[PDB]
Symmetry: C12
Subunit: 107 residues, 12 copies
């Protein structure tokens, strides 16, 4: 559990990303909303980094490449980036949950 330094924060950022991801698959987006959405992706990765152990900051950094800060990504590109985050986070927490369940069994 020592991999996730602030579990509450990482959980809520993840829930935000998953909810936004549900929205992009809801309908096509226009220029401005995809602008907001690249920006939100940037800031939300920063917040996640704050809440993770160093090796995971660096793992996530190896797996994710940022968006062109001057260019507007497509619905597809946004959907890939956010789907990656959501999947990585859910795997992270099935990890900490098989751990917690292991402790439940130890006691």
């Amino acid at each position: 559990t020592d991999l996730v330094e602030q579990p509450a924060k990482v959980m809520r950022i993840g829930t935000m990303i998953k909810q936004l991801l549900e929205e992009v698959r809801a309908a096509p987006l226009d220029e401005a909303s995809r602008n907001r959405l690249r920006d939100i992706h940037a800031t939300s990765i920063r917040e996640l980094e704050d809440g993770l152990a160093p090796e995971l900051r660096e793992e996530l950094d190896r797996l994710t490449l940022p968006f062109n800060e001057d260019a507007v990504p497509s619905d597809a590109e946004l959907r890939i980036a956010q789907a990656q985050l959501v999947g990585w986070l859910e795997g992270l927490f099935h990890g900490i949950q098989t751990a917690l369940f292991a402790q439940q069994m130890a006691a």
Copy 2:
């Protein structure tokens, strides 16, 4: 702590208001006036949440949210993103405070 939400009832109330409005925007297309009104609601509702959260969460929410351009009317898409961001963030916030409360129930189950 659960002490991060200084006024939990208020934050729950703003949150369900926003979730209900998001469901309405996903219900049918909107016109000029209703989009403008909905922008204004988004602004004041982030202000109320700020009132109801600990400083760390005021400044986190502030880092994650960008206000709308006050001279232009946002699109249906832009509004859905803004409010969806809020809704997801809040639902995560309360799965947090609920992991805390449930931990307390199990501690008191425990010492017996």
Copy 3:
């Protein structure tokens, strides 16, 4: 502080009235006369709600709602936004007093 809702029965019935109207607006398109009627109902029902709430929640509601422009007839969308705002805000209010009350039931249990 369940003392935030001073007249719970009244607030509940106004809430059910507004919710039922919202379902009607989403049911079918409206004409001028019915949209004016519903505008008027929105105004008076906000006033009844104010009557039934503690001052701080009256003032919160006031910060959250802008009345309608009486120089125009609002669109179905604008009405749907206003009433949806009310409905969600009310349901959140009662999930609050409900988690509180159930907590008291546990205190007594």
Copy 4:
């Protein structure tokens, strides 16, 4: 108490069920002129009968919330659906009110046991 807010519960409940059934009927299919007049008049008389069965405070609350129809014009399907939908919701709330009352008596009258 709160049950003394509704002076004649049997009457209020049956008027309410009448209005609910007609609301469902109006949403069932479009209406003609004659049906819209009958339905407006039913709306009027049913508000009067409902008034008869409520406490003064709810008589005047309902009055503050309801506006009569224009009698020189025949209202549209839209106005009628609004009028009756308002009634249905207001009554539904009224009875979750008295319903929380009766349940409250049930809880007191086991609490003493």
Copy 5:
């Protein structure tokens, strides 16, 4: 229960009206069947009156206005009139049933 003098009769007239109402919503009607149907509405209100206490005869009378006996009403008008009766009757009997249930609890 003193409001409904002959409960069996009122129940069967009501079941007749409700069944006819289901039929009008089943398909559009022609002239002759709408003629029969206004007439049945008239006679069935008479029969109901026979089975109700005076104040309810008068209440129902205040709420219902008869059809033009020389003119043929539309499917819509018939459907309104009969829906009114059905709703009023069902409310009447949820009344007598909350009463009977109250007696069940008293004993």
Copy 6:
């Protein structure tokens, strides 16, 4: 009483016959001959019911039902109304006699 149906088996039998025929008319459109036949069935079936009911119900049913014009063929709609009237009236009649029978079962539950 339950003594209002002098021959209960017979009335149940005419009733299910009529209900089955109503279901057939709602099944598909009819032609000249089948509408005529169905008119005749309606007539004789009201006569059989009269045989099986107490006088008060003979005369009530008579007040509620109008016979068909014997020289003209009724429409599909007119037939559905006539038979639907009968079916609803009968179903109400037997929820009556069943409220009686059930009352009897509870009385005998009771004195024990």
Copy 7:
């Protein structure tokens, strides 16, 4: 008086035969030859039913049914009416003897 149905097995199987044919007529349109065939079956099956019933129910059935005009071939509709009449009348007959018999089971219980 379960003695109204003198041969219950026979009446039951004729009843199931007629019901199954009714389902076939509602299944698809028919031609002349099959509609004549079904007309003939209707006649003979009414005669077998008569054989299996008490006199008063034979005479009731007779009052309720008019035979087919043999100078024409009936339409699918006319056949459907006649057989539906039989089926409903039979099902009512057996809900009668069934409420009676179950009542006897209770008398013995």
Copy 8:
């Protein structure tokens, strides 16, 4: 008794199941001439085999109820569906008959206990 009305129950049941399955097959899709002839002949032989397995009274009842097909013409999908549907219903009733019989023995043979 009533079970002695069906002299060979195994045979009657299997002929019956055969006819039921073909009825379902005919309603499955339209048929050609050759299939209609095979199916008419199956109808004939199956009535004869069925006769072999029933009491005389039911042999003659079935005969009063069934007419053979016209052998100089090939019957239509319609006539065949009628013929086999008649058989299926008649047999279904026959076995609710013997079924009420067996259940009757079950009730006697607990009644004495």
Copy 9:
């Protein structure tokens, strides 16, 4: 049970026929597959005969007429022939099963 001399064999031939019957109702067939299918019907009746008592060999023979060995039958004709077999077999086994169940009750 003395009517079915080799129950395992008759059961598997029957399962084969039923499975093939499901296939013909699956899609229309071409010339060659209907050729194979008449032939399979012939040989499968032979195999069934091997597994049945004489009176049933003769009963089945009375009820079934073979295909023209030089002509190709239609999807419909094949479907009739195989549906007959399937139905006859299922009836045969509801027979032997009501028998076996009867023995279960005897003991």
Copy 10:
């Protein structure tokens, strides 16, 4: 006996292979090469089954199955028939060996 399947695991394995392939042919239309391959699979798979069955079943299966023409490519229909024949025959074969096994379980239930 259950001793008619000399190698039961092998026959089950060939059988599920064939059933899976039948499901694929019913999934979508096939081209030249895939039909040819599937013909070859049918041939070798009957050979493997022969290896795994008692002589009586080798010769029965041989009486019931006709090989494909080795110079021509069978149609989608012809392949579905061939494999459906196999699948049905095998499923019947194992409801047989299962009626045997279940009989054994009941015998051992029995002598106790």
Copy 11:
């Protein structure tokens, strides 16, 4: 003789890989590059399976499978056949060792 599958974990994961790919081919049409890729995967995965099986089952598999013609790119259909062959053969293999193992569980019970 559970000793027929020498490395059960490896055979199981290769099996799940192939099954998942089969679902992908049935999901949508493919282009040249992806059909060549899947051809290559089919070859190497047969080799890994061989590594994990007893000799007689290697040789059985070899009798049952013909490799792909590398002079052409196979069609979606041909790939679907080859992989379906593998999947069915594998599922049958494991229903075998599973009925055996469950039988042992009963021997010990």
Copy 12:
């Protein structure tokens, strides 16, 4: 043992869940060029991270089974779906393997009781 085939189970599981979610996303809707490049690169880096968390034998098995993408061309929706589908299936099998392992320990550690 078999659980020692996966040296870092937490890491391998989360990389696997990441790849599964992206596979579902690609099948959700068609992709553009930029998305296909991001997705190819994600495929590369995720294979490297996955390697880090497996035993050498599975590192080299996975390598025998996977071919990198052509870096001078951008792969199609088809190639990407194949590549990631292969990964997903291979990992799913890997974990039913270690899953049968853990369950095996559960059975030994009641067997001695």
